[PDB]
Amino acid sequence: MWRLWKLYDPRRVLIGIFSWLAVLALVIHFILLSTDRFNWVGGAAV
Amino acid sequence: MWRLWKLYDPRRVLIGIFSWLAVLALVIHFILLSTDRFNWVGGAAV
Amino acid sequence: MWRLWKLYDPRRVLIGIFSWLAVLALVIHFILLSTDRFNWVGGAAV
Amino acid sequence: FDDPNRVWPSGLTLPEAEELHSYVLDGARIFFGIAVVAHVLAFAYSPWL
Amino acid sequence: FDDPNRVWPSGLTLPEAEELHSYVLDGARIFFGIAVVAHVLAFAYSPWL
Amino acid sequence: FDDPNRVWPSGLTLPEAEELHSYVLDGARIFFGIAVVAHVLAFAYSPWL
Amino acid sequence: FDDPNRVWPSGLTLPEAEELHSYVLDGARIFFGIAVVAHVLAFAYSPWL
Amino acid sequence: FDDPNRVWPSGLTLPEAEELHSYVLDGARIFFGIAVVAHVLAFAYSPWL
Amino acid sequence: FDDPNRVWPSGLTLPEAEELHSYVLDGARIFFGIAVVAHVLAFAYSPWL
Amino acid sequence: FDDPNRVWPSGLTLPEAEELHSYVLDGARIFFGIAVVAHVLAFAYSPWL
Amino acid sequence: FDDPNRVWPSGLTLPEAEELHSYVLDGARIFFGIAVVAHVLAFAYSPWL
Amino acid sequence: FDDPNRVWPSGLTLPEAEELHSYVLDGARIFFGIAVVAHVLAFAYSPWL
Amino acid sequence: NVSDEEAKEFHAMFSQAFTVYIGVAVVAHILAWAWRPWIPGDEGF
Amino acid sequence: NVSDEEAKEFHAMFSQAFTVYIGVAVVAHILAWAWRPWIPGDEGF
Amino acid sequence: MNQARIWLVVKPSVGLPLFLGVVLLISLLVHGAILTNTSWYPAFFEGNA
Amino acid sequence: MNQARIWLVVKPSVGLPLFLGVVLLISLLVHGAILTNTSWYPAFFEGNA
Amino acid sequence: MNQARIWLVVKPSVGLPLFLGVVLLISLLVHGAILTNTSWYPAFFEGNA
Amino acid sequence: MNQARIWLVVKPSVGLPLFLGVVLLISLLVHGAILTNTSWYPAFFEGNA
Amino acid sequence: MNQARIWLVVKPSVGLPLFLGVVLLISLLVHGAILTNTSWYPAFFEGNA
Amino acid sequence: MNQARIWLVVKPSVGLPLFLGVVLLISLLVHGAILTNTSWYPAFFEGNA
Amino acid sequence: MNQARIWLVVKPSVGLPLFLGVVLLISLLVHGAILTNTSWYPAFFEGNA
Amino acid sequence: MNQARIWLVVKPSVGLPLFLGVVLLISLLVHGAILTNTSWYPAFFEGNA
Amino acid sequence: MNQARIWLVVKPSVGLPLFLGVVLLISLLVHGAILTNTSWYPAFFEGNA
Amino acid sequence: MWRMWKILDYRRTVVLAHVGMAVLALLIHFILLSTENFNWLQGNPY
Amino acid sequence: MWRMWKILDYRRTVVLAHVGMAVLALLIHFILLSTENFNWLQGNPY
Amino acid sequence: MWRMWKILDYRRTVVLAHVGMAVLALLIHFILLSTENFNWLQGNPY
Amino acid sequence: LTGLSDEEAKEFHSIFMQSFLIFTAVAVVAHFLAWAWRPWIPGAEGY
Amino acid sequence: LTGLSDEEAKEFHSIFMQSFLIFTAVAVVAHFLAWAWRPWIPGAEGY
Amino acid sequence: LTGLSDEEAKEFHSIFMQSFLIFTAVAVVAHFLAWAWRPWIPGAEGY
Ligand SMILES: CCCCCC/C=C\CCCCCCCCCC(=O)O[C@H](COC(=O)CCCCCCCCCCCCCCC)COP(=O)(O)OC[C@@H](O)CO
Ligand SMILES: CCCCCC/C=C\CCCCCCCCCC(=O)O[C@H](COC(=O)CCCCCCCCCCCCCCC)COP(=O)(O)OC[C@@H](O)CO
Ligand SMILES: CCCCCC/C=C\CCCCCCCCCC(=O)O[C@H](COC(=O)CCCCCCCCCCCCCCC)COP(=O)(O)OC[C@@H](O)CO
Ligand SMILES: CCCCCC/C=C\CCCCCCCCCC(=O)O[C@H](COC(=O)CCCCCCCCCCCCCCC)COP(=O)(O)OC[C@@H](O)CO
Ligand SMILES: CCCCCC/C=C\CCCCCCCCCC(=O)O[C@H](COC(=O)CCCCCCCCCCCCCCC)COP(=O)(O)OC[C@@H](O)CO
Ligand SMILES: CCCCCC/C=C\CCCCCCCCCC(=O)O[C@H](COC(=O)CCCCCCCCCCCCCCC)COP(=O)(O)OC[C@@H](O)CO
Ligand SMILES: CCCCCC/C=C\CCCCCCCCCC(=O)O[C@H](COC(=O)CCCCCCCCCCCCCCC)COP(=O)(O)OC[C@@H](O)CO
Ligand SMILES: COC(C)(C)C/C=C/C(C)=C/C=C/C(C)=C/C=C/C(C)=C/C=C/C=C(C)/C=C/C=C(C)/C=C/C=C(C)/C=C/CC(C)(C)OC
C-alpha cells in the first residue's frame, strides 16, 4: 500500500485528510450538541 | 458484437454505463422509499 | 525559540500581535460593559 | 470542413473543438446525472407529485 | 494535447493551467469545508431541520 | 513557477504579486479588525444577541 | 454573390455560412420537435385547452 | 453615390447593401404576413373587437 | 466648413452627411405623417378629447 | 489656447469646436423657445398654477 | 510636477489641465449661484422651513 | 520597489503615485471633516440620538 | 500507457483496500442487523 | 528543500511550543473541571 | 424599400441583431401588456382549472 | 433641416441606431403610460370579455 | 432556410450566443408569464402540501 | 455660450448623443413625475371615458 | 453530441463562461420560482420555528 | 480650486461627461426624493384640480 | 478535478473574477432567499427588541 | 496613508472616478435609507404644510 | 495568505477595484438587509421623534 | 481483472471512489438519522 | 516526528495553527458564554 | 437493408437510439406509474 | 474507429459480457430476495 | 508519479500507518469513555 | 528566511520576551485588582 504515496502527493493527501477530519469532528460534535441526550454542556438529563 | 468496441471508446462506454447505472439505482431506491409498500426503513406494513 | 524571528519578519509579527491585542481588549471591555455584573460605568450593583 | 490543422475564427482547430466539446458533453451528463438524483429526492421528500 | 510549452488561446501553458486549477480546487475545498461547518451550525442552532 | 523576472499575463512579476497581495492581506486584517470591534459594539448596544 | 472563396465581413466564406446555417436550422427543428411534444403533453395533462 | 465597387464605412458595397436590404424587406413582409393571420385569429377567437 | 472632399471625424464627407440627413428628415416626415393620422384616429375613436 | 490649426484630444480644432457649439446653443434656444410656449399652454389649459 | 510641456496620461499638459479646471470651477460657481437663488425661492414659496 | 523612474502598469511612476495619493488623502480628510460637522448638526438638530 | 505489471500493482492495492473495506462493511451490517433489522414483516417492525 | 537539521530545529521550536500550549491547556481544564464539571449525570448537573 | 443604403453607414453586424432583437422585444412587450391588462389572456392560460 | 453636419462629428453607425431605437423607446413609453393611466386602453384589450 | 447568408454579415461569435440566449430568454418569459397568471402551474409546484 | 471648448476635450461622438439623450431622459422623467403625481394628467388620457 | 463545431465559430472564452453562467442562472430562476410559488419550500426554510 | 491636476490622470473625455451627468443625476434624485416624500410638491403639480 | 484545461480556452483574467463573484452572488441570493422566506432569520436580526 | 502604491497597479483614470462616484453612491444610499426609514426626514421635506 | 499569485493571472487593474467595490457592496447589502428586517435599526434612525 | 486499470485511470478512479463513497455514506447515515426506527441518536423504540 | 517538516511547510503550518486555534478558542469561549451553566459572566447557578 | 448504413451514420444512430429509447422507456414507465390501473407499485385493484 | 485491435476488442468484449452477466446474476438474486419480501406485481384485487 | 523513491514512500507509509493507528487508538479510548457516559445504541424500548 | 542574523534574532527575542513578561505582569496585576472588585468565577449558587 506504500505505492499509494508515489501516485499521490503525500503533502496534499495529508492536508485533505486533516481537512476532512477537522470538518467531520466539527460535524459530529455539533450534531451531538443539538441532541437532547448527548448535549453535554446543556446539562442533558436522561 | 465485439466490433462495437472498435467503433466506441471502451473507457467512455464504461463511464456512461456506470453513470447510468448509478443514476438508475438511486432513482429506483428512492422511488421505493416514497412508496407505502416498499419503504423498508420506514417500517412499512402491508 | 529565537529562531522564530529568522523565519518571520519581526515588524509584521509585532503589528499582528498589537493589532490582535487591540482588537481583543476592545472585545473584552465591551463584552463586560454589556453585562449587568461587570458594567463599571453603568453603576452595576451586585 | 475536416481540416485538422486549420485555425477557425474562434481560434481553435477542429480536433481542439472536438476535445473541448467532449468536456462540455461529459460536464452536461454529470450535471444531468446529479439533477436526476436531485429530482427523485424532490419527488420522494417534497410535496411535488 | 499534452504540450508543456504550447501557449493556448487563454495565454497559459498546460502546466500553468494545471497549477492554476489546483488553487481553484483547493479554494473550493476550503470553501466547501467552511460551508459544511456553517451548515451544521445552522442545523444545530436554527429551526431548520 | 518561481521566476522572479518573468512577467506573467497580468503584467506583474512574482515578487510584485507577493508585495501586492501583502497589502491585500494587511488591508483585510485591518478591515476585519475594525469589523470585530464594530460587531462587539453591535452586540453591546443593539438588541442583537 | 456566389463566391466560394471570398471571406465576408463576418469572417466566413459562403460555404461556411451555408454549413453553419444548416446546424442552426437542424437545431431549430429539433427544438421545435421537442416543443411540439411538450405542448401536447401540456394539452393532455394541464388545464390548458 | 452610385459606385458599385466603393466600400462604405459599414464594410459593404452598394450592391451588397441592396441585396442585404432585400432580405430585410422580404423578412419583414413574411413577418407582417404571419402577423396579419395572427391578428385575424386574435380577432376571430379572442374577445378583442 | 464647405469642403466636399474632406473626411470628418465621423468618417463621412459633407455631401455624404447631407445625403444621410435627407433620409433622416424624409424618415421623420413619413413617421410624423403616419403619427398624425394615428392621432386623429385616436381622437375620432378613443375617449381622448 | 487660440490655435486655429491644432487638433485637440477630441479630434477637433478650435474653430470646429466653436462651430459645433453654435449649433448646440442654437439647438438649445429653439428647444427652450418651444418649451416656453409649451409651459404657457400648460399654464393656460392645465390646473397648474 | 510643474512641467508646462509634459503630456500626462490623460492627454493634457499641466496648463491645459489648469484651464480646463477653471471652467469646471466657474461652471460650479454659476451652478451653485443659481442653486442658492433656487433654494431661497424654495424657502420663500414652499412649506419647507 | 523604490524606483522613482520606473513606469508601473498603471502608467505612473512611484513619485507620481505618492503625489496622487496625497490629494486622495487630503480630499478624504476634508470630506471627513465636513462630514463630522454635518453629523454634529444632525445630532444637534435632528431626533437622532 | 500502462504496462501489464503496473496494472497488477494497481489492482494489488485495489484488492487489498476493497477486501478490507467490504470486510468492515459486512461486519458493520451484521452488527446493524443484530441491533435493528431493516426488512419489515407484514405487520411492520 | 528542507535539510534534516533544519527540520530538527523546526521540530524543536514546535515541541517547546506544543508542550507549553498543552500544559497550560491541561491545567486550564483541571481548573475548569474543579469549577463546574461538563459531563452531566443521568439527572443532569 | 427606399432605405437600402442604411446598411452603408450602419454596420450590419450591429444593425441586424439590434433590429431583430428589438422587434422581438416589441412582441414580448405587446404580449406582456395584454397579459397584464386583460382577464381573457390569463384565462386562456388558466383553461378549465 | 439645418443640422445635416451632425453626422460629421457623430458616427452614423452609433447615431442612427441610437436615434431610431430611442424613437421606438419613446413610443413604447407613451403607449405604456396611457395603458397604465386609462381605463379605455385596457378595456380595448379586454373587448367583449 | 433561405437566410444562410445572414452569417456573412453578422459575426457568428456574436450572432449565435445572442440567438441561443434570446431563445432561452423567451422560454423563461413564457414559463414565468404562465406561472404568474395561472393557479395550476403554482399548484403543480405545491403538490399535495 | 462661453464653453465652446468643452468639445476640444470631450469627444462629440460621445458628448453630443449623451447630451441629447439625457435631455430627452429629463423630459420623460418630468412627464412621468407629473403623470404619477397628478389626477388631471391621467384624466387627460382618460378623456370622456 | 453533433455540435462540436459550435466552438469553431463561437469563441470559447465567451461561449463557455456564458454557457455555465446561464445554466446557473436557469437553476436560480427555477429555485426562485418554486420558492415564491409554494408554501413548502418556504416552510423548509422556516423549520420548527 | 486645488485639484486642477485631477485632469492630468483622469481623462476629461470620460471625467467631464461623468461629472456633469452625475450632478444631474443627484438633482433628479433630490427632486424625486422630495416629490415622493411630500404632499406639497405633488400638490404643486396638481394645482387647482 | 478533471477540467484543469478549462483555463487553456477561458482566460483566467475573466474566468476567475467571474467565478469568485458568481459564487459570492449565489451566497447572497441564498442568504436573501432565506431572509425573505423565514421568520427566524429576521428575528435573529431583531434580537430582544 | 500607507497605500500610495495602489495607484501603480490600478489605473487612476478608472480608479479615481470609481472611487469618487462610489463614495457619492454611498452618500445617496445613506440619505435614501434614512429618508425611507424615518418620519422626521420626510417631515423636514414637508415643512409647515 | 497562500493565494499571492492570484495577481499573476488576474490583472490588478480589474481585480483590485472589483474586490474592494464588491466588499463594499456586501457591506451595503448586509446593512440594508438588517435595516429592512428589524425595528431597532429604523428606530435608531428615528430617534426621539 | 487487473486489466481494468489499462482502461480506466487508477489515478482518477481512486479519488472519485473516495469522494463518491464519502457522499454515499453521509447520505445513508443522514437518511437513517431522519427515520424514527434507525435514528440511534434519538433512540425511539423499535 | 521531525520529518513532518520535510512534507508540510513549517512556515505556513505555524501561521495556520495560530489563526485556526484563535478561531477555535473564540468559538468555544462563545459557545460556553451562550450556555446557562458555563456562562461565567452571567453566573447562573450550576 | 444493410444499405441504410451507407446513408445514415451507424456511429451516431446507435448512440441516438440508446438515448432516445432510454427517454421513451422512462416516459412509458412513468405514464403507467401515473395511472391507477397500471401502477404496479401502488397496486390498485384492476 | 478507435485504436483497438480485433484481438483487444475481442478481449474486452468477453470480459464485458462476463462482467455484465455477473452484475445481472447478482441483480437477479437480489430481485428473487426482494420478491420473497414483497412482490411488486399486484393481483386483480390489489395488494 | 511524484518524485518519491520506493524507500521514501515506504518510510512515509510506515509513519503514516503508525500515526493513523495512534489517532485511532486515542479515538477508540475516547469512544470507550463516551460509551461509559451515555451509550448511543438504543435498545428495543428506546432510551 | 528574513535578513536577520542569529545575533539580531537573539537580541530581538530577549527584548520580545522581556516586553511580553512586562505586558503580562501589568495584566496580572490588573486582573488581581479586577478580582478584588468583582470575581468572575461564580459559585454553585451563582452570583
Ligand atoms: C429584451 C428582449 C429582446 C431582446 C433581444 C436582443 C436584443 C438586443 C440585444 C443586443 C443586440 C445585438 C448587439 C450586438 C452588438 C455587437 C455586434 C458587433 O459585432 O458590433 C461590433 C462592434 O460593436 C460595438 O462596439 C458595440 C456593441 C454593444 C452594442 C450594445 C447595444 C445596446 C444593448 C441592446 C439594447 C437593446 C434595446 C434594450 C433592450 C432591453 C462591430 O462589428 P464588426 O464589423 O465585426 O466590427 C469588428 C470590431 O468590433 C472588432 O473590434
Ligand atoms: C428600450 C426600448 C427601445 C430600445 C431600442 C434600441 C435602443 C437602443 C439600443 C442601442 C442603440 C444602438 C447602439 C449601437 C452601438 C454600436 C454601433 C457601433 O458600431 O459603434 C462603434 C463603437 O460604438 C461604441 O463604442 C459604443 C457602443 C455602446 C453604445 C450603447 C449606448 C447605450 C445603450 C443605449 C441606450 C439607449 C437608451 C436607454 C434604453 C434602455 C463605432 O462604429 P464604427 O464606425 O463601426 O467603428 C468601428 C470601431 O468600433 C471598431 O473598433
Ligand atoms: C436573459 C435570460 C437569458 C439570457 C441568456 C444569454 C443571452 C444573452 C447573453 C449575451 C449574448 C452573447 C453576447 C456575446 C458577445 C461577445 C461575442 C464576441 O466575441 O463578439 C466580439 C466583439 O463583440 C462586441 O464587441 C460586442 C459584445 C457585446 C454584446 C452584448 C449584447 C447585448 C447583451 C445581450 C442582450 C440580450 C437580450 C437582453 C436580455 C437581458 C467579436 O467576435 P470576434 O470575431 O471574436 O472578434 C474579436 C474582436 O472582438 C477582438 O477585439
Ligand atoms: C433613458 C431614456 C433616454 C435615453 C436616451 C439615450 C441616452 C443615452 C444613450 C447613450 C448615449 C450615446 C452613447 C454613445 C457612446 C458611443 C459614441 C462613440 O462613438 O464613442 C466612441 C468610444 O466610446 C466609448 O468607448 C464609450 C461608449 C459607451 C458610452 C456609454 C455611456 C453610458 C450609457 C448612457 C447613460 C445615459 C444616462 C442614463 C440613462 C438611463 C469614440 O468615438 P470616436 O471618436 O468615433 O472613437 C472611435 C473609437 O472608439 C474606435 O475604437
Ligand atoms: C444571473 C445569474 C447567473 C449569472 C452567472 C454569470 C453569467 C453570465 C456572466 C457573463 C458570462 C461571461 C462573459 C465573458 C465575456 C468576456 C470573455 C472574453 O474574453 O471575450 C473576449 C471579448 O469579449 C467581448 O468583447 C464581449 C464581452 C461582453 C460579454 C457580455 C455578455 C452579456 C452579459 C451576460 C448576460 C447573461 C444573461 C443575462 C443574465 C442577467 C474575447 O476572448 P479572447 O479570445 O480572449 O479575445 C481577446 C480580445 O478580446 C482582446 O481584445
Ligand atoms: C452580484 C453580486 C456578486 C457579484 C460580484 C462580482 C461578479 C461579477 C462581476 C464581474 C466579474 C469580473 C469581470 C471582469 C472582466 C474583465 C477581466 C479582463 O481583464 O478580461 C479582459 C477582456 O475582458 C472583456 O472584454 C469582457 C469584460 C466584460 C465582462 C462582463 C461580464 C458580465 C458581467 C458580470 C455578470 C455576473 C453575473 C450577474 C451578476 C449581476 C481580457 O483579459 P486579458 O487577457 O488581460 O486581455 C487584455 C485585453 O483585454 C486588452 O485589450
Ligand atoms: C450610482 C450613484 C453614484 C454613481 C456615480 C458614478 C459612479 C460610477 C460610474 C463609473 C465610474 C467611472 C468609470 C470610468 C471608466 C473609464 C475610465 C477609463 O478611461 O478607463 C480606461 C479603460 O477602461 C475600460 O476599458 C473599462 C472601464 C469599465 C468601467 C465601468 C465600471 C462598472 C460601472 C461602475 C459601477 C459603479 C458601482 C455601481 C453603481 C450603481 C483606461 O484608462 P486609460 O489609461 O485612458 O486607458 C486608455 C485605453 O482605455 C484606450 O483604449
Ligand atoms: C482542446 O480543448 C481543451 C481540452 C483545451 C478545452 C477543454 C476545456 C474544458 C476542460 C472544458 C470543461 C467544460 C465543462 C466543465 C463543461 C460543463 C458543462 C455543463 C455543466 C453543462 C451542463 C448543462 C446543463 C444544461 C444545458 C441545462 C439546461 C437547462 C435548461 C435549458 C432549462 C430550462 C428551463 C426552463 C426554461 C424552465 C423554466 C421554468 C421556470 C419558470 C421555473 O423557470 C424560471
Ligand SMILES: COC(C)(C)C/C=C/C(C)=C/C=C/C(C)=C/C=C/C(C)=C/C=C/C=C(C)/C=C/C=C(C)/C=C/C=C(C)/C=C/CC(C)(C)OC
Ligand atoms: C508590487 O505591488 C505594489 C506594492 C506596487 C502594489 C500594491 C498596491 C496596494 C497598496 C494595494 C492595496 C490593497 C488594499 C488596500 C487591499 C485591501 C483589502 C481589503 C480591505 C480587504 C478586505 C476584505 C474583506 C472581505 C474580503 C470581506 C468579505 C466578506 C464576505 C465574503 C461576506 C459575505 C457575507 C454574506 C454572503 C452574507 C449575506 C447575508 C445578508 C443577507 C445579510 O447579506 C445581504
Ligand SMILES: COC(C)(C)C/C=C/C(C)=C/C=C/C(C)=C/C=C/C(C)=C/C=C/C=C(C)/C=C/C=C(C)/C=C/C=C(C)/C=C/CC(C)(C)OC
Ligand atoms: C450618403 O449617405 C447614405 C445615403 C449612404 C446614408 C443613408 C442612409 C439611410 C437610407 C438612412 C435612413 C434613415 C432613416 C430611415 C431615418 C428615419 C428617421 C425617422 C423615422 C425619424 C423619426 C423621428 C421621430 C421623432 C424624432 C419623434 C420624437 C418624439 C419625441 C421627442 C417625443 C417625446 C415625448 C415625450 C417626452 C412625452 C412624454 C410623455 C409620456 C409620459 C407619455 O412619456 C412616457
Ligand SMILES: COC(C)(C)C/C=C/C(C)=C/C=C/C(C)=C/C=C/C(C)=C/C=C/C=C(C)/C=C/C=C(C)/C=C/C=C(C)/C=C/CC(C)(C)OC
Ligand atoms: C485647456 O482646456 C480646455 C479649455 C480646452 C478645456 C475646457 C473645457 C470647458 C469649456 C469645460 C467646461 C466645463 C464645465 C461647463 C463645467 C461645469 C461644471 C459644473 C456645472 C459643476 C457643478 C457642480 C455641482 C456639484 C458638484 C454639486 C454637487 C452636489 C452634491 C455632491 C450633492 C449631493 C447630495 C446628496 C448626497 C443628497 C442626498 C439627499 C437625497 C436623499 C435627497 O438625495 C437623493
